Design an enzyme around this catalytic site. Sequence first.
Site, PDB file in Angstrom:
ATOM      1  N   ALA A  38       4.131   0.548  -5.351  1.00 60.00           N
ATOM      2  CA  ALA A  38       4.021   1.962  -5.685  1.00 60.00           C
ATOM      3  C   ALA A  38       4.273   2.836  -4.462  1.00 60.00           C
ATOM      4  CB  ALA A  38       2.650   2.259  -6.276  1.00 60.00           C
ATOM      5  N   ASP A  39       5.415   3.514  -4.449  1.00 62.99           N
ATOM      6  CA  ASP A  39       5.775   4.385  -3.336  1.00 62.99           C
ATOM      7  C   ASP A  39       4.788   5.542  -3.211  1.00 62.99           C
ATOM      8  OD1 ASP A  39       8.397   3.068  -2.657  1.00 62.99           O
ATOM      9  OD2 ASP A  39       8.860   3.711  -4.707  1.00 62.99           O
ATOM     10  N   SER A  40       4.970   6.358  -2.178  1.00 67.70           N
ATOM     11  CA  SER A  40       4.092   7.499  -1.942  1.00 67.70           C
ATOM     12  C   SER A  40       4.484   8.678  -2.828  1.00 67.70           C
ATOM     13  CB  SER A  40       4.143   7.912  -0.469  1.00 67.70           C
ATOM     14  OG  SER A  40       5.416   8.432  -0.130  1.00 67.70           O
ATOM     15  N   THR A  43       3.367   7.859  -6.325  1.00 63.44           N
ATOM     16  CA  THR A  43       1.925   7.902  -6.533  1.00 63.44           C
ATOM     17  C   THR A  43       1.434   9.336  -6.683  1.00 63.44           C
ATOM     18  OG1 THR A  43       1.908   7.387  -4.152  1.00 63.44           O
ATOM     19  CG2 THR A  43       0.950   5.752  -5.649  1.00 63.44           C
TER      20      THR A  43
END
Length: 81
Positions: A38-40, A43
Amino acid sequence: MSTTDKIEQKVIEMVAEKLNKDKAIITTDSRFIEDLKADSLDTVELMMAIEVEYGIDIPDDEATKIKTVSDVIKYIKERQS
């Protein structure tokens, strides 16, 4: 009688909509963050849906206090005023 109990069983539907995790994947130690990577930027909205859904707030400081099924029900529980 308590309604929070329904949250412990409803969490499955939450984590499944938060990171789009299939019901067949919803686990207590669901590490979608690593497994699903899950990338930033992702998210941002993904984790945001948890605020508009539960109707509560979760700052970065507590971002890791509601990620797991045991933490989400343990935190949101005491958080629920």
